[PDB]
Amino acid sequence: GYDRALSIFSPDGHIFQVEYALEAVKRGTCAVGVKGKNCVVLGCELQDTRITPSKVSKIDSHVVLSFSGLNADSRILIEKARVEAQSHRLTLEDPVTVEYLTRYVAGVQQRYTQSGGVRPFGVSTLIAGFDPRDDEPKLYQTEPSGIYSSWSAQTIGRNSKTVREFLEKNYDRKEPPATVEECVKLTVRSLLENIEITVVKPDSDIVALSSEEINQYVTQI
Amino acid sequence: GSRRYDSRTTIFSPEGRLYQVEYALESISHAGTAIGIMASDGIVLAAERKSTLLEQDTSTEKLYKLNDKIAVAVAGLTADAEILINTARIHAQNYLKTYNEDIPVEILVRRLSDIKQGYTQHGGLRPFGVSFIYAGYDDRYGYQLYTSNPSGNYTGWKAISVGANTSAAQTLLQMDYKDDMKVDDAIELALKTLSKTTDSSALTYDRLEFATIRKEVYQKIFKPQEIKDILVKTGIT
Amino acid sequence: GYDRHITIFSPEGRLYQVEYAFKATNQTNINSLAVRGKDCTVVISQKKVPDKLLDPTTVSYIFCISRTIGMVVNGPIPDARNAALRAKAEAAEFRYKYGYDMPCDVLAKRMANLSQIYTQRAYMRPLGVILTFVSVDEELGPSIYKTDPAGYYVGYKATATGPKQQEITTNLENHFSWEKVVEFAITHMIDALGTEFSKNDLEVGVATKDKFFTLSAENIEERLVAIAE
Amino acid sequence: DRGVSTFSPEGRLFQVEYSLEAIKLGSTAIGIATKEGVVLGVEKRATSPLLESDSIEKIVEIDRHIGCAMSGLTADARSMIEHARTAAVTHNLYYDEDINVESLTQSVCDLALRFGEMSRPFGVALLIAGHDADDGYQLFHAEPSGTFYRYNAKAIGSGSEGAQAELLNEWHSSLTLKEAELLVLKILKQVMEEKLDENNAQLSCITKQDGFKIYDNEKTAELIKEL
Amino acid sequence: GYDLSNSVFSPDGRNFQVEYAVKAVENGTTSIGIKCNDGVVFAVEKLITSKLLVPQKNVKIQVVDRHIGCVYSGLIPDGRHLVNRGREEAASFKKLYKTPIPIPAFADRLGQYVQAHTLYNSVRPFGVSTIFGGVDKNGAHLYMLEPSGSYWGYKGAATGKGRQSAKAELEKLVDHHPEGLSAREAVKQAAKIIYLAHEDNKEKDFELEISWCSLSETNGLHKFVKGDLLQEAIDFAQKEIN
Amino acid sequence: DRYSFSLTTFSPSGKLGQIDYALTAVKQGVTSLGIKATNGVVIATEKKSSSPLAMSETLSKVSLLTPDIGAVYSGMGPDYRVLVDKSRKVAHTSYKRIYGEYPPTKLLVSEVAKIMQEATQSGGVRPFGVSLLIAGHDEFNGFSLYQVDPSGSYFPWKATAIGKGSVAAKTFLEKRWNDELELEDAIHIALLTLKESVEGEFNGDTIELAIIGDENPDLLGYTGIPTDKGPRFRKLTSQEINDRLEAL
Amino acid sequence: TTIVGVKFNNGVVIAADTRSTQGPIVADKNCAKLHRISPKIWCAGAAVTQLIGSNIELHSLYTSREPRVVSALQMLKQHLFKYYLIVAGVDPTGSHLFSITDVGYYLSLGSGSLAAMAVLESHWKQDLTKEEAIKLASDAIQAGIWNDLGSGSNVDVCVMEIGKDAEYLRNYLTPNVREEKQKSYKFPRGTTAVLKESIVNI
Amino acid sequence: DPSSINGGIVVAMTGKDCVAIACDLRLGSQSLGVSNKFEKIFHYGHVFLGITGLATDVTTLNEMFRYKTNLYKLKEERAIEPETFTQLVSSSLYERRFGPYFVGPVVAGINSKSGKPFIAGFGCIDEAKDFIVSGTASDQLFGMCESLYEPNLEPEDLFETISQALLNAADRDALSGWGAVVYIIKKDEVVKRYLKMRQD
Amino acid sequence: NYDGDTVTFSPTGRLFQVEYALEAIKQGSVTVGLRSNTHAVLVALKRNADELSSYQKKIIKCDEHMGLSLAGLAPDARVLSNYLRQQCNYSSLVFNRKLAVERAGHLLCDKAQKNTQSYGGRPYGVGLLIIGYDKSGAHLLEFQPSGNVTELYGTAIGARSQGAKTYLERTLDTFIKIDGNPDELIKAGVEAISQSLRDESLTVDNLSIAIVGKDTPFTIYDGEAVAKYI
């Protein structure tokens, strides 16, 4: 078995492979997530649109996962997340909470940063959804190092710093977007600095907005 | 120990890239051009071979059947491709054994791309130097045209080219492709793109591999005479 | 830069570590020659024992692989003993699996295939020895098969190994009971190397129809006396 | 390159010395042990205003009377905490008794040097605080080098160099718990780059009666006013 | 640049790591072996690095089974590693068969093990040369095994720092006594040779350790030379200096 | 074995260096050629002897893989020897145990090339330094001639040459090959092509030639089974080669 | 089943009956029980043959030597011991006859073994010729055919001579050909009632 | 004995340039009849396979042989022949020597090259030239086939012969019946016929 | 070029990774061992990271009859002491026999040597002084990372251990004949370790003493228990 330590500390205390895995994420496309009072809206800015997968993926009926970075690496994380969500139902009789799913995904990413013979995932994920029988929105983020945290609004990918700067002044944690329209319009405005929108609502009510709806938001802005 | 001789294939560059994957994509860029065109009534796979004494009528080096409804065009190392093609054939037959249904095209493409990605993240081995074009039919989406590369990324296309002169071929495809062409029109577009992207002075039947999938779905990998027939009527002759 | 340290190809298509294992075959500075009679195969090997503290009966580069097969090795004795132990296990295993004694050529191919693996797998280095197998095969008669660090083996009418293997080889080329065959090989080694041998300077192995055996210092002196007469 | 388990000519493992400098970049964690309990305080260090700081768990519960702070690569901490929690739970299963704090610190530190071709040592340092009948209120500093010491007062992280000197001046054996709360907040306010408040700092305490408790933003705010 | 790995041939065909392992052996203390007419005598110089060493307690010579004695120079932990393998190997022979392992058979088993440590770069060559031998059904045998895995039978053997002077004295012993030395008298010369070899390491004091395995004196079993015979050899060695 | 990583990797130009260096070894090897006729295939090579005292009869550069399939090589002989052993084994375990018959030529060639590709991607192994010309007959495809490269790529040929004089020989084969060639004509062309590549003596002892042709019931070793045909692979003896060289 | 093996002055002959039974029911009336391991090594039993023969062929290609009956015997013996045959043949060391292990100048196995051994014990003599050996081996099989219910139909004979090719005499004797039936039972067309008829697209 | 759990019979016959394969349709659970549409005859290209025995094994083997003959066609670029398929069946069955499927397979087909009709029974191959029977009524089928069969029957006559043999053997078997299907296989066409029989 | 792995010899025959592991002990706090015929004494100078911190445990108890003290990497000492406890435990289980001190040292000898000849591991960065009492009497053993285990009357390992070791050699003829007066043997150990101090003096928190003997089970003195010996 190949077990070379690929992720090791540099003399300055840095793990270069994890640092370079983050660079792979920053070259990913987009994942803007705006959490509101009742909404979590996820968005991204000769190809066959029917069969090209949407970036937002349902891990379970109530939890969806968007990502940024290496698409091929993300499929492996999403597959492991879906298997775990089913196993938790199978053995603990309950669907996963958003934090439990986030903890498992970040655990796999952390495991790949200190296992021999493997490189870290070049994937950062935005995990959004609702805990079972619950209604307060959750919006978590994971990174290649394994760090996971909860956000009111977050972006990952190219132009993340510009969009996060835009979010940090248009989003106010004093008064989150009260209406689903405000959740989408803020998300579209951030993505306007092509638009896909997915709205995550309690009781497994996850819907992707149509292009006609998105056009109305864009035209309004 | 062997640590001094390890090339560290599965590591990131400081720019976030994977050297071996990028070097494997550079390898395919010198391989023969393979083109896939998804028409309204089917898909067209066309590949340019890359000698007088070569047994051309027997050589099948770029187009392979994976199924009764799925075929692949190959760009890159043919020996590496034969390994992946065998697994795809077994995986498609495993799906039919489990569910009594023909495997969906995307499920097969995803499984093959997951094998490619695995060689990119762990194991210490080099990536497969192969790019595929999957032309397939299933009852869910109908005619589907996918492509996959050594990194394990796969994307669906209406028209796509892999191998040498991909940029030139895609420019021609963008100009001349319509969503409502028929297979015969799609066939014609395939040879013109190959003719205007080949490095040789002329395009002849011995340098070509051709395959179509048409509706029940029927896979036809063209014989040299049939390529010769379609070559003349297209006008390239 | 590391193509010279493990058995991978150089830009010229060469395996330098295999070529350097050939250089290791001549460190002992011992010359050996094998000749076939019509009934017997004879190996003559130089026996150089410079240290007077050595027990000469232990210094030996000729091994009895089986009842009928003998092996003479050119190269360091730890690698020589490694190959000898492997050849003995192969010979015994063949007899167990197939019910009859392994032929000399099958064993030579058997050991050449092992050397081929060291040539292709990076974690195994080549053994720096050349193995000459001799026997009287029940089908092919007297036989000489020589293996090298490259995994290459071939049968020989006669053969010589060592630093002066060329001088012995052309000497055999010009020319081209087992006691006479022994007396021929000793004489031709004296002429080729230009050095008279005492009974302590030579190792002699004789492959006959029923057994392979090595002559003692008394037996070698008997042959030296016969050459004197 | 060089092997991960290599010694330097001075007798120190290269990866351990490199891992220790990763801790110096972490958020500050401060712990003070008194006769009435142990107070643990951490610098939250939220990277963005949109980041929900209440989700930053830099003080965790290991057992009912054992808690710890973390500083450095806090992703490595969760694996160490999960092992610590399992060890505390496994002790109660095998011995029908709560694990000792020093024994819990030993179980964690057994993982520290179990790396080589684990690819690397952990890049996180813990301040383990706990109470038991055998030794009372105890505070330990677990390092990736495998060494740990019992501390009356200890500060780890980016501001540890200045905080520890201040802890030297201020600690005495007669400190009450509320003094320790103020002392931890005082030193945190001194070393944090941000202006200290209930949203960018966290407090926790371990007592025999109430066990391991993390102070709410409300209760911390009242304690912050007292300064 | 061919000396950084164990299993690498230099362009001349040499293994430099094995040659470097020999340099470790030449740095060790002098150990000798003398094959007498019916047994083998082993002697070793034990350097007294400090006065705090417990006398006659840091034993260097090791027994394998009951009839094989082993002494080595260089990296003592490597020699103990080799003897541990030899004891496992002598036992496995005594289980499959019933006789105690023959000395030539034992020599090959150790030689294969030492040679196997030169085959891969993941392992280090042994940093010892072992003088070993004993009495079996075919008489007395004496072997010296080098880090390359090479071993030969010897009438007399020596390794360590004072190996050159010890070899000169052992050669005189072989020259002066073609009839074959006696076991008791060989013990005295073993003391004499070790004391003579110590002049190359006179900067520190040394303790003499002798063991023997004789068909007549020790009934074919390996025993340490202690008590009156040990002191008698020391007096003979001390007298023979002057 | 600590070598679990690939020793063959991509270069920044996309080349696989160990494969290119393995191909260099083949080009430095002795010239071997194959010609496919209407009623047979002929594979021929030079037997280069290391010593005049070596018994070149013992070294067979042409090997029977199955009764109807034979192989010749250029490059590292020991690599070919172990490939032939693996090819013969795979022809039984992978095909003949399952279907009760020997594989068709293209299926054996793909199995041989699979072994070669594995040495290209597996950890701790260099590629094989041989190209093989594999000649065979099967009931449905007739006679075929395949070249297998160290990378694992294989191609069907009407006629081809590999080795030291492959470039010159392939030019000569282009002039002489035609789709109406008979096996005896192919053998004659093969000997002429090998004549221009052999440096020293050109005779039955320095030349190894084999054919895939008619079934040989005389080489079957038993009678009484009408459906057992007899091997099509036949190595020509030194006397036979000399006869065709005397009347050349 | 009746299998015999008889050695004669220049080889060995094996013979067998061709009846296969599933209980009291004759499944195959012309089963071939003489199995070829190698061109001159043949086996008969009262899968292991197709695997031993495969490895014998591979071993013969590896060693470039003719297969030996001891090698087949050793392989069969080791394989069967890991988890009842007559192995005969001619190799460069001569003709051999084994059972699985005992050698013999004549052997018999199967349900008709005792009947066959009776004929062998009665008529076998040293230095048989090839024609006499075939006659003796055939009469032994015929005895099993007439007297043993488990044996019947035809006699298959394989003759392995030292300097010659092995000759497999499939259905050497056919002493049980059915007589012509009293009546022909060809039904007139349309006799069978058909509910549905359809062409199958293969 | 798991073969008698489900019942059912398969018979194959050779004619003049044609083969016939026939089976009953009863799927039973001991005495209880479950399904009358359990066809035990399958084809892979132009090679037909009848499987008697345990029904779950019949489904498992058909899926396995559809698996293997598909990979054969992809690898070989040609359809498998009845003689090659017989070897494939034989090796597949002995691949589970100590875990055997409780089946009796019957191969029927015409070799596409030689044009000669081929039938086979079984791991040990019974390549008969006249007829192969399998199932619970094999003894009844042997009696009927041995009496009715004559060589070189035309396809029309072969249909009547194999039908009457099947119907009358099924009438005397408790676990066979509930309908019957006959395949008259020629090189150019394959005819499938359902027989009228007693439904008890 | 030759110090990057324990599997490499230097051109002069040296093992640099082993020597670098030896340097780890010289960076550690001094611990002194000495013995008479009846008693063996461990004297250790415990080291504290900070004056707000406690002093690291230097002496480990194996069982009633044997214990050790460490200098260097503490996690390595625990690994070795755990292995030593397993060996002593095995002897009691399978033979009802107390493991001899000399035999226990050779088991540490073999375990330490395996990390100096095989790739992947590292030499233990700790030195140990093992005291024990068995049928042969009092025993003091010095363990080194190179695998060398030595039986001594007295010894010192750690930083500035030469001052203690020089004193023990000068006092050698005295303390070996102390015999059945354990407090005077402990006193001689405390004077030796006081010869290795540079700036700090022996305090109640600094000093740690262990003893084992004929009718003395292995006991460790810490805190006020050592105030009579300071």
CB burial of D153-166 (b: ≥16 within 10 Å; e: otherwise) equals: bbbbbbbbeebbeb
**CA dist list (Å): I185 to I34, I39, I181, I192, I211:** 8, 8, 7, 11, 9
Helix (H, G, I), strand (E, B) or coil at I5: coil
| Domain span holding position C76 | 1-229
Q: Which tokens belong to B75?
A: 């760009």
Question: Which residue of chain F comes nearest to G54, CA vs CA?
Answer: F92
Residue F152 placed within a domain: yes
D and C touch per CB criterion (3+ pairs under 8 A): no
Beta bridge partners of B20: none
Question: Which chains have 3 or more CB–CB distances shorter than 8 Å to chain F?
Answer: A, B, C, G, H
Q: How many whole angstroms separate alpha carbon A103 and alpha carbon F194?
A: 70
As a whole number of Å, the end-to-end CA separation of chain E is: 50
Mutate to test the interface with G, among F97, F222, F223 (most CBs of G within 10 A): F222
Method: cryo-EM
Q: Does E3 touch chain B (CB under 8 A)?
A: no
What is the architecture, at CATH level 2, of domain E9-241? 4-Layer Sandwich (3.60)
For residue F177, give the nearest of B7, B23, B53 by CB distance.
B53
Question: Which chains have 3 or more CB–CB distances shorter than 8 Å to chain D?
Answer: A, B, I
The alpha carbons of chain I give a radius of gyration, in whole angstroms, of 17
- Cβ of D55 and A149 within 8 Å? yes
How many Cα atoms occupy the beta-carbon half-sphere of F181 within 13 Å?
24
Q: Per residue, what are the HEC states of C146-188?
A: EECCCCCEEEECEEEECCCHHHHHHHHHHHCCHHHHHHHHHHH
- Cβ of D154 and I52 within 8 Å? yes
How many Cα atoms occupy the beta-carbon half-sphere of B137 within 13 Å?
17
Residue with tokens 């058995």: C7
What's this structure's resolution in Å? 2.4
C and F touch per CB criterion (3+ pairs under 8 A): yes
Give me the domains of chain D, ranges plus CATH numbers: 7-226 (3.60.20.10)
Phi, psi (degrees; rounded to nearest 5) at E190: -60, -40
Residues in I whose CB is inside 8 Å of some CB of D read: 3-5, 16-17, 20-27, 48-54, 56, 72-76, 78, 120-123, 125
Q: Which tokens belong to C135?
A: 């026997």
Of C70, C56, C105, nearest to C205 by C-alpha is C70
Of H120, H124, H122, nearest to H109 by C-alpha is H120
**CA dist list (Å): B180 to B160, B184, C180, E121:** 16, 12, 95, 65
Tally the domains of chain I: 1
Q: Which tokens belong to H14?
A: 């050779």
Give the count of beta carbons closer than 10 Å to the beta carbon of residue G172.
18
C and I touch per CB criterion (3+ pairs under 8 A): no
- Cβ of F5 and A1 within 8 Å? no
Tell me, what DSSP letter sits at residue H161?
H
Residue F10 placed within a domain: no
User: Which chain B residues are closer than 8 Å to E5 by Cβ?
Assistant: 4
Of F55, F46, F31, nearest to F200 by C-alpha is F46
Burial class (CB in 10 A: 0-12, 13-18, 19+), C176: exposed
Could you state, in order of their start, the residue ranges of all structural domains in chain B? 3-234
- For chain C, what is the total number of helices (H) and then of strands (E)? 6, 10
Percent helix, strand, coil in chain A, to 5, is: 35, 25, 40
Beta bridge partners of G14: G5, G158
CB I156 within 8 A of CB I133: no
| Domain span holding position F109 | 17-247
- Cβ of E17 and I9 within 8 Å? yes
Is the C-alpha dihedral spanning G80, G84, G90, G95 positive or negative? positive
Distance from CA of C141 to the nearest CA of G (A): 14
Question: Which residue of chain G comes nearest to F228, CA vs CA?
Answer: G39
Q: How many whole angstroms separate alpha carbon H146 and alpha carbon H148?
A: 6
Question: Which chains have 3 or more CB–CB distances shorter than 8 Å to chain H?
Answer: B, F, G
What is the architecture, at CATH level 2, of domain A9-220? 4-Layer Sandwich (3.60)
D and H touch per CB criterion (3+ pairs under 8 A): no
User: Which chain H residues are closer than 8 Å to B90 by Cβ?
Assistant: 71
Domain spanning G3-173: CATH superfamily: Aminohydrolase, N-terminal nucleophile (Ntn) domain (3.60.20.10)
Query: Residue F62 is part of a domain; what is its CATH number?
Result: 3.60.20.10
Q: Does B14 touch chain I (CB under 8 A)?
A: no
Of E152, A124, B217, nearest to C77 by C-alpha is E152
User: Which chain B residues are closer than 8 Å to D3 by Cβ?
Assistant: 1, 3
Distance from CA of E28 to the nearest CA of B (A): 27
Cα–chain center distance at E234: 19
Q: Does B90 touch chain F (CB under 8 A)?
A: no
Of F112, F196, F177, nearest to F148 by C-alpha is F112
- Cβ of B89 and H71 within 8 Å? yes
Beta bridge partners of B63: B73
For residue F101, give the nearest of H75, H84, H90 by CB distance.
H84
Q: Does I4 touch chain B (CB under 8 A)?
A: no
Angle (CA) I195-I201-I202 rounded to 5° is 85
Distance from CA of F98 to the nearest CA of B (A): 17
Give the count of beta carbons closer than 10 Å to the beta carbon of residue F155.
19
Orientation of helix C104-120 relative to helix C77-98, angle to 10°: 120
- Listed in order, strand segments (DSSP E) in G47-117 are 85-91, 94-99, 102-103, 106-110
How many Cα atoms occupy the beta-carbon half-sphere of C178 within 13 Å?
26
Helix (H, G, I), strand (E, B) or coil at I172: helix
Distance from CA of G173 to the nearest CA of F (A): 14
Beta bridge partners of F137: F143
Burial class (CB in 10 A: 0-12, 13-18, 19+), D199: middle
Just list the catalytic residues of G.
1
Residue F11 placed within a domain: no
Q: Does F123 touch chain A (CB under 8 A)?
A: yes
Provide the Cα torsion F181, F184, F188, F194; round to 10°.
90
CB C131 within 8 A of CB C84: no
Q: Which tokens belong to C77?
A: 């004795």
Beta strand pairing call for I39-45 and G2-8 = unpaired
CB H170 within 8 A of CB H30: no
**Count of C–E CB contacts within 8 Å?**
94
CATH number of B3-234: 3.60.20.10
- Cβ of B96 and H64 within 8 Å? no
Tell me, what DSSP letter sits at residue D99?
P
Residue F42 placed within a domain: yes
Distance from CA of B6 to the nearest CA of E (A): 14
Q: Which tokens belong to B109?
A: 């493409």
Distance from CA of H89 to the nearest CA of F (A): 9
